[PDB]
Subunit: 217 residues, 2 copies
């Protein structure tokens, strides 16, 4: 079937794995392992990086027959397009493109902090800015069950990931924003998702690679 290659990490493959699971996609996961010692060995990946036929070899990568895809957003969009989990009106396509990029911005702010040796000094700073961020997502979701209204689409898999992951980092962050909390419960409530989370193939942690100072493994 399909092939999803990535580190044995949650990271950029989380929303991908959930969507594949949700759409009932048939796939195999090629999971790469990293070293621990001062040399975080990546030979397992680098050895076949150029032998899979990728135009821009990267992790994660999806291979579906003739289609070799890299870049997590392109991979999501690909599966999304195949199952109609995309925005329909231009109104919805706009929100989609905004959130797709907005979440990628949020995702990267956590990543920067969690890989920085000065994590301890920088963390409080992050936490003070976090509620401004969460407020805008809250404002945007409103009374809607999903981010583009009534129908679940690919952005919700992205949203879930970056929102839920912040809740592990700082457990109480979403408490002031009920609708965000409910979103997380509603997503996890979805039949295909809950069933997957109760399986042994889940993998919600480690969040980051072994080189991170937080959420590393």
């Amino acid at each position: 079937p399909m092939t999803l290659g990535y580190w044995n990490i949650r990271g950029l493959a989380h929303s991908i794995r959930l969507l594949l699971e949700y759409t009932d996609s048939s796939y195999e996961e090629k999971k790469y392992t990293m070293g621990d010692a001062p040399d975080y060995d990546r030979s397992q990946w680098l050895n076949e990086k150029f032998k899979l036929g990728l135009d821009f070899p990267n992790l994660p990568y999806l291979i579906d027959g003739t289609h070799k895809i890299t870049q997590s957003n392109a991979i999501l969009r690909y599966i999304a397009r195949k199952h109609n989990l995309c925005g329909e009106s231009e109104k919805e396509q706009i929100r989609e493109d905004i959130l797709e990029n907005q979440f990628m911005d949020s995702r990267m702010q956590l990543a920067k902090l969690c890989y920085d040796p000065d994590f301890e000094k920088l963390k409080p700073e992050y936490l003070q800015a976090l509620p401004e961020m969460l407020k805008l997502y809250s404002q945007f979701l409103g009374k809607q069950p999903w981010f583009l209204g009534d129908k679940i689409t690919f952005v919700d898999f992205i949203a879930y990931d970056v929102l839920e992951r912040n809740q592990v980092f700082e457990p109480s962050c979403l408490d002031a924003f009920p609708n965000l909390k409910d979103f997380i419960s509603r997503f996890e409530g979805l039949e295909k998702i809950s069933a997957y989370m109760k399986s042994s193939r889940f993998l919600p942690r480690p969040v980051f690679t072994k080189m991170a100072v937080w959420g590393n493994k």
Copy 2:
């Protein structure tokens, strides 16, 4: 008409401006100025940041009637969808999604170097890495006039920007990659483009904000 708000910089608005000119779009530019002294005064933007009705207030923004849009890729996509400067087949949509994100990564590698105070120490590393980056883009463009084949699309506006920008940073970088050189020439040769470049509203520099150690103004 439309409104494009951004710093008085080339930056992330470059490819949007070009695409607006090319599509014959009518628009006004709300350009913001930054401070000089150790306090890079951004009050000009900050004062109205929350008064324009943006969901996720940010620069650049595009307001088109009821449509308020932030995130440069969402703005590009909005205009492109309007004038059909997008990919049609899934094959084209894939290359489009890959490229959008791949170009965004390239754009960010240069930005990080040029805003870094250790710029003079880091520049050598970037330069030795650049020739792997451009080769992948040559490989991908091949003998096609534009990145999705024969029809020009939005990714070409992104492409031109980051490729041409590297040529300003390092004049000889595209030397080994003729098709990339020709792409730049072909892009600049487009009627609406050349005309715009010969106008007083072009603004190809500064490349980065006043805080950049390179390309700053």
